Design a protein around this ligand. Structure first.
Ligand SMILES: [Zn+2]
Ligand SMILES: [Zn+2]
Lengths: 90, 101, 183, 110, 96
RNA sequence: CGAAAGGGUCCUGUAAGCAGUAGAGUAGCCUUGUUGUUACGAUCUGCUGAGGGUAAGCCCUCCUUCGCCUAGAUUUC
């Protein structure tokens, strides 16, 4: 009986009472950023084998124009206004 | 380094427990019973040089004093300061108690 | 019969479970499993091993002071058997278990109160440092949206928002490498 | 109902296929299990693995194969003249945040 | 799997199921000791060919408790509710 | 039926990262000491019975997804 009296007293005092879209948006954006960081780290892990061999320098490999155009497109750069086709060697 | 580390956990290689050492420090009667379960002529230094905290006999007073500066003795002191684990602490961990009327 | 509790970890010790160590001072040590038994024989302190009820009580992660915990005890003074007393005792145990569960959930929420504010602060810091990694439209997509807006007399910003919504809906992963065409 | 040319992304649980395997054979066995998985999934006996997929399998040495790996299998047409099989599968490694918790999904053709 | 002195309402199947068998959802026979088969194996039960000569055949069995903890490890809980009551609230419980 | 996934059950033992008037002390800047302050610093505490694994001879899932199907070949009083 004492336990039940304490229980109803706590229920009157709100001991068991249980309780923002901007916060939800900023949390979703942070989760997206963490996913992008994980993808970048996975790309680095795929590219690097520095225990056994050194990475070929970037200046010794000719980058493909299609890949450069695609990457600048995903970065949001208008490539037709700058004309990468004339810049590409043959 | 531990002598013969492979068989260190055997019951025939068991050492005195920390709560027993705590009771030895609190009560000289408990320590007296434990020392009665041994033979004095087979002990290092005829049993005259004893560290209660480490529950260990030593060959000489200088050996005991030199042992006190080492880290095993200081680890035993830190463990005794923290307090040995007992059945009372085990009961309090689950919130169980003894009703004696 | 009765349910004991493990000396080392505090788990329920049902019959035929674990092992008992009989010490020569006259003290018995019941262990629920060989894990607890071997940690005891290695002289590990349960108060420092984080998976034990001893550690959790010492760290204050268990509900310790509470009225519902005063009903179970080791009764050293027996009571004469009474059928009505035993039945109302069973009803009491059921009610006490429900109340204890509710109070334990409240206790845990009080422990985990501040997580939302900490996570929001971390999210704001991460976004402020990495605004450039947020999703964006392609340059060719901006071209086609601009010319469609010019043709339809609509808002290019509006077409940008619904295109960003479609890109957020459609999630596509990138595959490493690529096939080399045979000669 | 399903066309010959089709690509799907799968999670391969290599842990249960490499359980108890000799250490010097764990990664080649992983290569063979990936080929067997692709043959079972697409019906094609001719399976070709991407070199980046091989690097991903061999990333942690001969006995450090990941428990799970996300792959894309693309059933494509064998256009070469005098080919024994009309179809083949090409298997690539997929860049994902975490290979756990993903279902088999059809890759959009566009 | 309940007795007269154990009032827990529970079935015979251990927590997590019988290892490499599944769940017992039908009528079952509890036999003292061990029998020649393995798990999943068909077992033939037969009436004894002769009238018994021991008091053990005449004894009536009075069970107090049947173990239903997990046999996939050192199971310490007879029921999922008992496991949750001992465990307390987990992180995933508030996450859900 | 198969491959995933989810839930359960077990195993280990509290992830990465961030924070802290916790931290033996040391060195700078000034209010020259009044957590003076800032910096570093094994470790400790919190987020966190968390993280990781789980059938490969564990369990459940018409009602969580994707795929497969009435073959082919050989032989038979
Ligand atoms: Zn000492
Ligand atoms: Zn235990």
């Amino acid at each position: 009986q004492a336990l039940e009296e304490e229980e109803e007293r706590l229920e009157k005092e709100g001991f068991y009472d249980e309780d923002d879209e901007e916060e939800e948006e900023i949390l979703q954006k942070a989760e997206y950023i963490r996913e992008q960081h994980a993808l970048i780290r996975n790309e680095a892990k795929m590219r690097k084998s520095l225990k056994n061999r050194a990475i070929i320098p970037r200046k010794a490999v000719k980058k493909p124009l299609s890949q450069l155009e695609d990457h600048l497109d995903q970065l949001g750069v208008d490539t037709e206004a700058i004309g990468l086709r004339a810049r590409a060697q043959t | 380094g531990v002598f013969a580390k492979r068989t260190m956990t055997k019951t025939r290689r068991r050492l005195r427990d920390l709560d027993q050492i705590e009771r030895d420090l609190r009560s000289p009667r408990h320590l007296q019973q434990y020392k009665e379960t041994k033979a004095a002529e087979d002990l290092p230094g005829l049993g005259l040089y004893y560290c209660i905290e480490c529950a260990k006999w030593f060959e000489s007073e200088t050996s005991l004093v030199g042992h006190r500066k080492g880290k095993p003795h200081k680890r035993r002191l830190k463990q005794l300061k923290e307090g040995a684990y007992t059945h009372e602490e085990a009961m309090a961990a689950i919130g169980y108690r003894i009703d004696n009327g | 019969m009765r349910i004991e509790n493990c000396f080392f970890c505090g788990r329920p010790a049902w019959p035929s479970k674990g092992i008992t160590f009989m010490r020569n001072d006259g003290k018995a040590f019941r262990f629920c499993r060989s894990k607890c038994h071997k940690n005891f024989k290695m002289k590990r302190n349960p108060r420092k091993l984080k998976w034990t009820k001893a550690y959790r009580k010492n760290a204050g992660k268990e509900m310790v002071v509470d009225s519902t915990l005063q009903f179970a005890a080791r009764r050293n003074v027996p009571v004469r058997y009474n059928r009505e007393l035993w039945q109302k005792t069973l009803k009491a145990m059921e009610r006490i278990s429900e109340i204890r569960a509710r109070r334990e959930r409240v206790f845990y929420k009080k422990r985990m109160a501040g997580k939302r504010a900490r996570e929001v602060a971390a999210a704001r810091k991460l976004v402020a440092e990495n605004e450039h990694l947020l999703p964006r439209l392609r340059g060719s997509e901006k071209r086609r949206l601009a010319e469609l807006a010019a043709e339809r007399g609509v808002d290019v910003e509006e077409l940008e928002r619904e295109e960003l919504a479609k890109l957020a809906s459609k999630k596509k992963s990138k595959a490493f490498g690529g096939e080399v065409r045979r000669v | 109902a399903i066309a010959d040319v089709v690509a799907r992304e799968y999670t391969i649980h290599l842990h249960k296929r490499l359980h108890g395997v000799t250490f010097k054979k764990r990664a080649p066995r992983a290569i063979k299990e990936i080929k067997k998985f692709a043959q079972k999934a697409m019906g094609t006996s001719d399976v070709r693995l991407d070199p980046q997929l091989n690097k991903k399998v061999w990333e942690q040495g001969i006995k450090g194969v990941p428990f799970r790996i996300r792959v894309r299998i693309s059933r494509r047409r064998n256009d070469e003249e005098g080919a024994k099989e009309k179809l083949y599968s090409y298997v690539q490694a997929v860049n994902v945040k975490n290979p756990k918790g993903l279902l088999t999904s059809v890759v959009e053709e566009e | 799997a309940s007795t007269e002195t154990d009032l827990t309402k529970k079935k015979i199947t251990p927590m997590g199921g019988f290892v490499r068998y599944g769940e017992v959802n039908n009528d079952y026979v509890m036999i003292k000791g061990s029998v020649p088969g393995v798990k999943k194996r068909i077992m033939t039960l037969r009436k004894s060919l002769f009238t018994h000569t021991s008091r053990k055949a005449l004894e009536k069995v009075e069970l107090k408790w049947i173990d239903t903890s997990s046999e996939f490890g050192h199971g310490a809980f007879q029921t999922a509710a008992e496991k949750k009551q001992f465990m307390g609230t987990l992180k995933k419980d508030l996450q859900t």
